[PDB]
Design a protein around this motif. Structure first.
Motif, PDB file in Angstrom:
ATOM      1  N   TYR A  68       0.982  -1.725   0.413  1.00  0.00           N
ATOM      2  CA  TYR A  68       0.310   0.226   0.107  1.00  0.00           C
ATOM      3  C   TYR A  68       0.642   1.488   0.177  1.00  0.00           C
ATOM      4  N   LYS A  69       0.797   1.911  -1.521  1.00  0.00           N
ATOM      5  CA  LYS A  69       1.937   3.423  -0.893  1.00  0.00           C
ATOM      6  C   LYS A  69       1.159   4.449  -0.003  1.00  0.00           C
ATOM      7  N   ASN A  70      -0.155   4.559   0.049  1.00  0.00           N
ATOM      8  CA  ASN A  70      -1.089   5.068   0.805  1.00  0.00           C
ATOM      9  C   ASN A  70      -2.165   5.200   1.401  1.00  0.00           C
ATOM     10  N   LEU A  71      -3.011   5.889   2.171  1.00  0.00           N
ATOM     11  CA  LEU A  71      -4.098   5.166   2.946  1.00  0.00           C
ATOM     12  C   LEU A  71      -4.806   5.382   1.519  1.00  0.00           C
ATOM     13  N   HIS A  72      -4.981   6.190   0.562  1.00  0.00           N
ATOM     14  CA  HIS A  72      -6.234   5.560  -0.403  1.00  0.00           C
ATOM     15  C   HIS A  72      -6.102   4.358  -0.733  1.00  0.00           C
ATOM     16  N   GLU A  73      -4.797   3.725  -1.636  1.00  0.00           N
ATOM     17  CA  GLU A  73      -5.219   2.831  -1.612  1.00  0.00           C
ATOM     18  C   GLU A  73      -5.661   1.621  -0.700  1.00  0.00           C
ATOM     19  N   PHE A  74      -4.965   1.102   0.998  1.00  0.00           N
ATOM     20  CA  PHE A  74      -5.688   0.237   1.801  1.00  0.00           C
ATOM     21  C   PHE A  74      -6.996   0.658   1.802  1.00  0.00           C
ATOM     22  N   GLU A  75      -7.803   1.472   1.886  1.00  0.00           N
ATOM     23  CA  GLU A  75      -8.940   2.509   2.131  1.00  0.00           C
ATOM     24  C   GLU A  75      -9.517   1.878   0.823  1.00  0.00           C
ATOM     25  N   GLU A  76      -9.226   1.821  -0.295  1.00  0.00           N
ATOM     26  CA  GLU A  76     -10.112   0.978  -1.215  1.00  0.00           C
ATOM     27  C   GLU A  76     -10.514  -0.514  -1.344  1.00  0.00           C
ATOM     28  N   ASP A  77      -9.393  -1.109  -0.770  1.00  0.00           N
ATOM     29  CA  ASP A  77      -9.364  -2.435  -0.350  1.00  0.00           C
ATOM     30  C   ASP A  77     -10.753  -2.723   0.667  1.00  0.00           C
ATOM     31  N   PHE A  78     -10.495  -1.893   1.735  1.00  0.00           N
ATOM     32  CA  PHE A  78     -11.109  -1.776   2.479  1.00  0.00           C
ATOM     33  C   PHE A  78     -12.963  -1.710   2.458  1.00  0.00           C
ATOM     34  N   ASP A  79     -12.625  -0.740   1.475  1.00  0.00           N
ATOM     35  CA  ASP A  79     -14.344  -0.345   0.832  1.00  0.00           C
ATOM     36  C   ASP A  79     -15.160  -1.797   0.127  1.00  0.00           C
ATOM     37  N   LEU A  80     -13.625  -2.795  -0.612  1.00  0.00           N
ATOM     38  CA  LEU A  80     -13.946  -3.589  -1.214  1.00  0.00           C
ATOM     39  C   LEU A  80     -14.462  -5.009  -0.224  1.00  0.00           C
ATOM     40  N   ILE A  81     -14.354  -4.778   0.924  1.00  0.00           N
ATOM     41  CA  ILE A  81     -14.422  -5.903   2.130  1.00  0.00           C
ATOM     42  C   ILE A  81     -16.015  -5.894   1.583  1.00  0.00           C
ATOM     43  N   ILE A  82     -16.758  -4.557   2.741  1.00  0.00           N
ATOM     44  CA  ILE A  82     -17.356  -4.010   2.797  1.00  0.00           C
ATOM     45  C   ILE A  82     -18.494  -3.842   1.977  1.00  0.00           C
ATOM     46  N   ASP A  83     -18.219  -3.365   0.666  1.00  0.00           N
ATOM     47  CA  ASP A  83     -19.250  -3.106  -0.462  1.00  0.00           C
ATOM     48  C   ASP A  83     -19.813  -4.859  -1.039  1.00  0.00           C
ATOM     49  N   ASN A  84     -18.540  -5.409  -1.456  1.00  0.00           N
ATOM     50  CA  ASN A  84     -19.146  -7.089  -2.423  1.00  0.00           C
ATOM     51  C   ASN A  84     -19.705  -7.449  -1.032  1.00  0.00           C
ATOM     52  N   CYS A  85     -20.012  -7.271   0.486  1.00  0.00           N
ATOM     53  CA  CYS A  85     -20.868  -8.111   1.222  1.00  0.00           C
ATOM     54  C   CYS A  85     -22.804  -7.138   1.100  1.00  0.00           C
ATOM     55  N   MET A  86     -22.648  -5.966   0.728  1.00  0.00           N
ATOM     56  CA  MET A  86     -23.634  -5.269   0.888  1.00  0.00           C
ATOM     57  C   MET A  86     -24.743  -5.814  -0.204  1.00  0.00           C
ATOM     58  N   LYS A  87     -23.432  -6.335  -1.312  1.00  0.00           N
ATOM     59  CA  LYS A  87     -24.038  -6.789  -3.266  1.00  0.00           C
ATOM     60  C   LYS A  87     -24.413  -7.722  -3.017  1.00  0.00           C
ATOM     61  N   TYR A  88     -23.831  -8.571  -2.187  1.00  0.00           N
ATOM     62  CA  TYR A  88     -23.968 -10.144  -3.082  1.00  0.00           C
ATOM     63  C   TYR A  88     -24.950 -10.966  -1.245  1.00  0.00           C
ATOM     64  N   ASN A  89     -25.381 -10.099  -0.172  1.00  0.00           N
ATOM     65  CA  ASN A  89     -25.676 -10.157   0.742  1.00  0.00           C
ATOM     66  C   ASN A  89     -26.955  -9.176   0.665  1.00  0.00           C
ATOM     67  N   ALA A  90     -28.061  -9.866   0.601  1.00  0.00           N
ATOM     68  CA  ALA A  90     -29.500  -9.011   0.880  1.00  0.00           C
ATOM     69  C   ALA A  90     -29.398  -8.934   3.045  1.00  0.00           C
ATOM     70  N   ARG A  91     -30.015  -7.473   2.768  1.00  0.00           N
ATOM     71  CA  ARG A  91     -30.680  -6.469   3.727  1.00  0.00           C
ATOM     72  C   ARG A  91     -30.567  -6.830   5.337  1.00  0.00           C
ATOM     73  N   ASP A  92     -31.465  -8.602   5.233  1.00  0.00           N
ATOM     74  CA  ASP A  92     -32.111  -9.070   6.150  1.00  0.00           C
ATOM     75  C   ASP A  92     -30.839 -10.487   6.449  1.00  0.00           C
ATOM     76  N   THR A  93     -29.461 -10.009   5.996  1.00  0.00           N
ATOM     77  CA  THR A  93     -28.355 -11.521   6.490  1.00  0.00           C
ATOM     78  C   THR A  93     -27.707 -10.746   7.674  1.00  0.00           C
ATOM     79  N   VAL A  94     -27.403 -11.661   8.311  1.00  0.00           N
ATOM     80  CA  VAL A  94     -25.785 -11.437   9.536  1.00  0.00           C
ATOM     81  C   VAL A  94     -24.911 -10.886   8.685  1.00  0.00           C
ATOM     82  N   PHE A  95     -24.874 -11.430   7.389  1.00  0.00           N
ATOM     83  CA  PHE A  95     -23.234 -11.235   6.866  1.00  0.00           C
ATOM     84  C   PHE A  95     -23.409  -9.380   6.113  1.00  0.00           C
ATOM     85  N   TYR A  96     -24.670  -8.981   5.285  1.00  0.00           N
ATOM     86  CA  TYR A  96     -24.554  -7.745   5.036  1.00  0.00           C
ATOM     87  C   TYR A  96     -25.142  -6.662   6.779  1.00  0.00           C
TER      88      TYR A  96
END
Length: 121
Positions: A68-96
């Motif tokens: 990670y060259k800068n904080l932006h790159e690290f945040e990008e990867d953290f947001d992928l964790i969150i954002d991928n889960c919120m797409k694949y899983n529905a609102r009513d799930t323990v994952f979301y």
């Protein structure tokens, strides 16, 4: 060159700070829902849904390679964790719901990380 060494020391110090950030964010996932890659053995269609999978173990591997060259790159990867889960899983799930709580709690940590990165340079 001495200039290359200095740049390398700055990357090392950023890596130290990102490791402490990573630890703090991962504590906000006490169920370890985001600890490892989604298994393609267990969710064989996952890559039809999610184009760039991410998880805390994969971030840790990148971090330890000073990738990670800068904080932006690290945040990008953290947001992928969150954002991928919120797409694949529905609102009513323990994952979301776990992703929502990780996002909300991690925002606080990332807010002060940005100040520290800017401050220390």
């Amino acid at each position: 060159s001495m200039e290359q060494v200095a740049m390398e020391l700055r990357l090392t110090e950023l890596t130290r700070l990102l490791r402490s950030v990573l630890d703090q964010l991962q504590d906000k996932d006490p169920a370890r829902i985001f600890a490892q890659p989604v298994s393609l053995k267990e969710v064989p269609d996952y890559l039809d849904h999610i184009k760039h999978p991410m998880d805390f173990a994969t971030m840790r591997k990148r971090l330890e390679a000073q990738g990670y060259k800068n904080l932006h790159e690290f945040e990008e990867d953290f947001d992928l964790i969150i954002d991928n889960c919120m797409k694949y899983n529905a609102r009513d799930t323990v994952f979301y719901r776990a992703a929502v709580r990780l996002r909300d709690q991690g925002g606080v940590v990332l807010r002060q990380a940005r100040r520290e990165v800017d401050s220390i340079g």
